[PDB]
Design a protein around this ligand. Sequence first.
Ligand code: PRO
Ligand code: PRO
Ligand code: PRO
Ligand SMILES: [Mn+2]
Ligand SMILES: [Mn+2]
Ligand SMILES: [Mn+2]
Ligand SMILES: [Mn+2]
Ligand SMILES: [Mn+2]
Ligand SMILES: [Mn+2]
Lengths: 312, 316, 318
Amino acid sequence: FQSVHSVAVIGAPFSQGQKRKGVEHGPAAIREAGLMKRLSSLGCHLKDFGDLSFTPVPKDDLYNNLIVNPRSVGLANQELAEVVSRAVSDGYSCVTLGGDHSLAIGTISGHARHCPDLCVVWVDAHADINTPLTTSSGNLHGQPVSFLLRELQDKVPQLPGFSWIKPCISSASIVYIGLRDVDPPEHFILKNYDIQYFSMRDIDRLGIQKVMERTFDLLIGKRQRPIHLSFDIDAFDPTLAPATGTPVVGGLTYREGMYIAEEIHNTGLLSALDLVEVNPQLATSEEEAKTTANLAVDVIASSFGQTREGGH
Amino acid sequence: VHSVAVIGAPFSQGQKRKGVEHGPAAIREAGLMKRLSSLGCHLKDFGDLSFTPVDLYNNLIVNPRSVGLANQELAEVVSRAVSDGYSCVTLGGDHSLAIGTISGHARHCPDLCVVWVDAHADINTPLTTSSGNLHGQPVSFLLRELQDKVPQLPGFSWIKPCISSASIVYIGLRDVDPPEHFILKNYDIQYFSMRDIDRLGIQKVMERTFDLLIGKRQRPIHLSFDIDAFDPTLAPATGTPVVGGLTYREGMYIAEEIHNTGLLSALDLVEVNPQLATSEEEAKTTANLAVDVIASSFGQTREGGHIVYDQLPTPS
Amino acid sequence: NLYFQSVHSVAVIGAPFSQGQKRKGVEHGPAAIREAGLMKRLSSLGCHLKDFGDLSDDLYNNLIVNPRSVGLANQELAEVVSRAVSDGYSCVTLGGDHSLAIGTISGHARHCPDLCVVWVDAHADINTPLTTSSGNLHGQPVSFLLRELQDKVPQLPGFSWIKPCISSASIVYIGLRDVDPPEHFILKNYDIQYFSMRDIDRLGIQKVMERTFDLLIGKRQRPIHLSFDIDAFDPTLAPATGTPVVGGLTYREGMYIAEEIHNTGLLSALDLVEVNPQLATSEEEAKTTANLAVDVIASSFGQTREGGHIVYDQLPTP
Ligand code: PRO
Ligand code: PRO
Ligand code: PRO
Ligand SMILES: [Mn+2]
Ligand SMILES: [Mn+2]
Ligand SMILES: [Mn+2]
Ligand SMILES: [Mn+2]
Ligand SMILES: [Mn+2]
Ligand SMILES: [Mn+2]
């Protein structure tokens, strides 16, 4: 094979960062679409940690009539952070299957425990950077980055179950790609703190090649750094990825998404990847659910060396 | 903070396919007013105009009287909306309604320029049309340099040609009749076909469009936007669909660039025909797309940048 | 219409090969494309037309299926194409599976030894009889044609008539996205130039066509052979085909390729292959694929998005 990678796979069947049921079946859907076989065929040394079972929290209602399930979200992420830490500690590139995007709190925190100069490429229709004070929905899947960013620490209140989190990335160390549904406060956060982002509009103008070039220039232009790719399937157009809870029209094409993944592979710096927000229960047909899972597998496989030219 | 007037113009007699008169209602139902309200627009809804009801012309041109007259009535409403300080959004209805909207707009803004976003040039004369459908001719009646090639139709004498060939640019062209192509080339009318977009990219297409129309000075902009500019996969509920059109992204980009000028004075969103859809979702997606065009033309962004946001809350 | 920007002489041959692969139905490609109104469309573009109509075995090494039927059918097809081209026609062949390019290219080369090939396809179809995993000859045609690969290619039954006729420098691929590892090796090792979908994502279709022509006709005008597999298009656009691969050309990119081919004035033969109406799930899927096939062929002979191919004389006056 062109290159061998050691890859751990963690299922995180978690739904409480949002209100729509079924995203907890994300990890199963992706698995049934053949993830392990595909990574095997590419030369990957694989370790399957299986699908985690998160400790429920009995009482966990609306916090200040706004934040939904903070204790469950906080604890599930604390648990996931331990496993991701273990995997990275053991030397694996850590693939976590979601589950809603609240789980990036745990995956990035866990990763950061071993990589002080970690950087993040966040591929998403959404910035997910509302603080608990700026959120309109109160859904923590739209807040994960606020708890991780050092610059926002003074703006984030201490939520129950969240005391264990330490901000671990600076505003210069995360680049967003694919944005198209951004709240006014999130826009203010991005601009005010100099967080670099390439919205769908930036991609329309520059094209995905220049987007990736600039992305790497910003993050790894001066030195090599481990990369955490946090990939929300809703980055893709809903015609390609319909089985997801917060679809937004005018997303990435299949080609652009593969291009992102291929460029991440080509760095040789991919250290962890999240594939989140696949909700097969939201598909209007079996083939809608299966196409979304198949697309998830293509993203992950391309991140680990699958190409459009038979070079693997 | 835009003041926006919405006029329902249920034109159907510019073409032969029934249903297009329900376009203005389909768009309303898709939640147009809620969207423009969330954008901080000052809104006036004129409701749907009831035109006064009314023989073929040279055995070809159909219902021309009804079309000519309804356009005269439309043009007065647009004139007075513009006058009352509103940006004028006219919901269609077939594209023959542009005769009335551009005419009425050119009364108070003589220096207007036109961005025509369409699969079609709609510049056949009453003598070059094969179909006889007036939705395929509106630009011939409006264009100054073309007057001696256009005969006087019953109901159309009121129309004073108000735009020169250098003040209209087309974007999206892919189904242009031979006489149309002749007109485009011989009158030096600038256009960016699908093929020009494939070469240049929509960013460059918009830069060059504005260079041509407002390169010398700021001017009021009239955006005449036919939903069939978009690929039929995206906008299937429409009468003359043509494969290989704009993507969702390209169309939002045009609207956004139009907004970013701060010059948009009037906008037509034409040719949504809910009855031509093969299902209720196809009908609804077409109307949702129409809303997205209008909202982006007035400030909706892909970046959350529509409102001013000054200060983060503190747990302080 | 009396007046056109250009007038082409075009021969049409139906070549319903199905034996270069295993799925039934592709032999109905030529009928599907004719029923989508191909002849009418070409007439409307001012072409002089000659319609040649539609033309009408043990495993090799326990793998390669139908070598004699395929090798021999291609010998016959080669004759028809050579005749058409010799008589001054740009020769359009409707497939049928892609194994037919063995015949069309070999025949074309008899009269046009200096031809170049633009191969538009999800696949490189450059497996040898020794590297192929499927045994399907439609995945092997380029290996028979290429000079530099002759010593890597064994003599098959039905194939003694074929002389390799193109050098590795005279073929450029566009659209590649499903390349077997031994195919990747050949491409790199013989320095065959290709624009994969990834290359199109980076350069854009305009620069891909510019660079393609710089590679092939940059030094001198040469007859162009366009071998165009419908599966180069995204399966959402061309679902009716045997080996569909996600992430393909858009409608606009495909038409752009054909328009630029037309603009060279050098198009000398064109294959339009792999349309299999039976693999559609609906009549609209089948007809869309056939209509797209017609749009490709039409656009190769002057159909454009802007409507300048028919020449208009003067506007009537009232
Ligand atoms: O915070 C939220 O819940 C939404 C999710 C997408 C953008 N903001
Ligand atoms: O003139 C007509 O009626 C048609 C409409 C689109 C192109 N020409
Ligand atoms: O040789 C074959 O049969 C396959 C078909 C596409 C790629 N190679
Ligand atoms: Mn997200
Ligand atoms: Mn998202
Ligand atoms: Mn129109
Ligand atoms: Mn139109
Ligand atoms: Mn092929
Ligand atoms: Mn192919």
